């Protein structure tokens, strides 16, 4: 393997963790791995929230390349914010190591419930740089420039439920991964994984949409209108969105450009929750508006898809997945 | 005993059962006892939808009671709409019979998937006449001019999840049910279980709130905006509401009236979660906007206050559940 590769476990269906290790002495931690933010941190041992005390935690003191900074920082994300100061220090991400500035968190109480009802120990961001905090160069690209790997690129080869884990490979893409033609799009901006795509679910349409491949996302978030006529007469109520996981009348989204076509059947984006009452799934469809029509292909399209992250070709490649490898 | 008590079973904390029966053989179904709305309904042998093959289904020509009625009829509830024809038979409720106007559903499908994922086979109304569909006298009003219960009223001893039992009783108040001061509070309309509350959750108040008191509502809704502002700094996030069941920021409901005072604390309206994530829990509250500020006090606070539906004195009284019988 002359590429990095990185194994991944499914968490419930809703998340899936990778490992990487900080500081001259290998220190251990859990990660989301986020396409959608440009950080790195850990919590620290100087974190005394009571949601640190049950993750793996950073001590600068025990590793000789640590290098002080301190600069102050806060980090947001969709379920709350983190705060602490930057740091460097030897990063180690599969077989590949380099050092790296990451933000080392202090205080974790507004991130919660997330935080302390996760397994995960802290987030490293696949994004781009100007998505960051303090201008920190994306760790691949770092490691291309280092000349430790062969391309700016990294493919998601993502976990599937009481199915199969899955692989985060750094430096090169990798055919055992994907069946079928790999197919490029160009990024519409230098900021997130968004590309640019025709969108049908039924009879409604949507020229041109954003799309943004994000493995930070456990649903498909499609526009509030979009959704509405979608599960129009379908038959999928909502307590004050779940169905039969039978339902003949759920539709297949349809994704094309100009080189590709992409397709997210039901069996996709249904979560089976017999526990609840038999034959009952959740639809793992969200509704949320951007300023523009936009579409957030997260873990469920991801799933079913192979995907190429290439920094240096500004683009997202996209296969089907092999069921098994 | 000289009051009907019907013995009622919690599923999942979401809902809660009671059974009776129709037909001069007695034919068995279970119910869900709404005072939500004033209509009984049982699925029809007639009815073909895929809902009602797991369902006990009511059959006319096994019963010499039964009077052919046919009048075209559609139920309408906040999960669907289920529609058949008015039909006429005893009906049968723990210790009491009488002969009652219901509807026999034919289609179901309209009503999924709550149906097919939910182990009731109809619904019993036990709200006012005005409310119903066909001007149907309510099943207790009726018993009461039939002479076969000392009072119309009946009261709800909520079962509760893990815990006990509860039971439905028809016709007088028993003391063993509830402990403390039982106090009346007046309608405000002879169509739903409404009353008059001042509501008081933090520092967020509102004078003489509607509340409605119904037990076909698993949970305790709140006006939009009056949520927002109570879970404003509170540490409870919601994925595109959940918390730590902890949060020691969790504040407790508090309504009053000019002869009572009735509290709603965290562990009322907290659900646990654990197969989801470590001391996570679901709240059990709903952002919900009447033309007017209204509170619809369900089955949490149900599960904790004992309560009495007067017909006669149009009130509705109010006490603590006993913990155990």
Same mark, same amino acid.
């Given at each position: 393997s002359s590429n990095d590769n990185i194994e991944l476990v499914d968490f419930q269906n809703i998340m899936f963790y990778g490992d990487a290790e900080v500081g001259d002495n290998q220190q251990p931690f859990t990660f989301i791995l986020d396409t959608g933010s440009a950080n790195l941190w850990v919590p620290s041992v100087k974190c005394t929230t009571a949601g640190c005390l049950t993750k793996h935690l950073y001590d600068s003191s025990k590793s000789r390349t640590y290098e002080k900074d301190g600069t102050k920082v806060e980090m947001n994300y969709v379920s709350g914010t983190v705060s602490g100061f930057f740091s460097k220090d030897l990063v180690t991400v599969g077989n590949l190591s380099l050092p790296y500035k990451?933000? $080392?968190?202090?205080?974790?109480?507004?991130? $919660? !419930?997330?935080?302390?009802? /996760?397994?995960?120990?802290?987030?490293?961001g696949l994004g781009w740089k100007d998505l960051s905090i303090g201008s920190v160069d994306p760790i691949v690209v770092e490691l291309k420039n280092q000349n430790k790997i062969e391309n700016a690129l990294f493919t998601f080869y993502l976990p599937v439920h009481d199915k199969h884990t899955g692989f985060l490979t750094i430096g090169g893409i990798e055919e055992r991964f994907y069946?079928? =033609?790999?197919? +490029?799009?160009?990024?519409?901006?230098?900021? +997130?994984?968004? %590309?640019?795509?025709?969108?049908?679910?039924?009879?409604? /349409?949507?020229?041109?949409?954003?799309? %943004?491949?994000? /493995?930070?996302? &456990?649903?498909?978030?499609? =526009?509030?209108?979009?959704?509405?006529?979608?599960?129009?007469?379908?038959?999928?109520?909502?307590? =004050?969105?779940?169905?039969?996981?039978?339902? /003949?009348?759920? !539709?297949?989204?349809?994704?094309? &450009? $100009?080189?590709?076509?992409?397709?997210? $059947?039901?069996?996709?984006?249904?979560?089976?929750?017999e526990d609840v009452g038999p034959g009952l799934c959740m639809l793992n469809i969200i509704g949320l508006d951007f300023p523009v029509p936009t579409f957030i292909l997260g873990d469920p399209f991801m799933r079913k898809y192979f995907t190429v992250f290439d920094y240096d070709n500004h683009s997202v490649g996209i296969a089907l997945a092999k069921k098994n490898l």
């Open positions: 990451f933000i $080392e968190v202090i205080d974790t109480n507004g991130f $919660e !419930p997330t935080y302390t009802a /996760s397994t995960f120990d802290g987030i490293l069946e079928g =033609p790999l197919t +490029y799009e160009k990024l519409n901006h230098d900021l +997130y994984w968004q %590309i640019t795509l025709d969108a049908h679910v039924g009879n409604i /349409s949507l020229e041109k949409a954003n799309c %943004i491949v994000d /493995s930070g996302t &456990s649903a498909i978030t499609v =526009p509030t209108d979009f959704l509405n006529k979608m599960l129009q007469n379908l038959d999928v109520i909502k307590v =004050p969105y779940v169905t039969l996981c039978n339902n /003949s009348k759920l !539709p297949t989204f349809e994704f094309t &450009s $100009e080189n590709g076509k992409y397709t997210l $059947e039901p069996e996709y984006y249904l979560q089976h929750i």
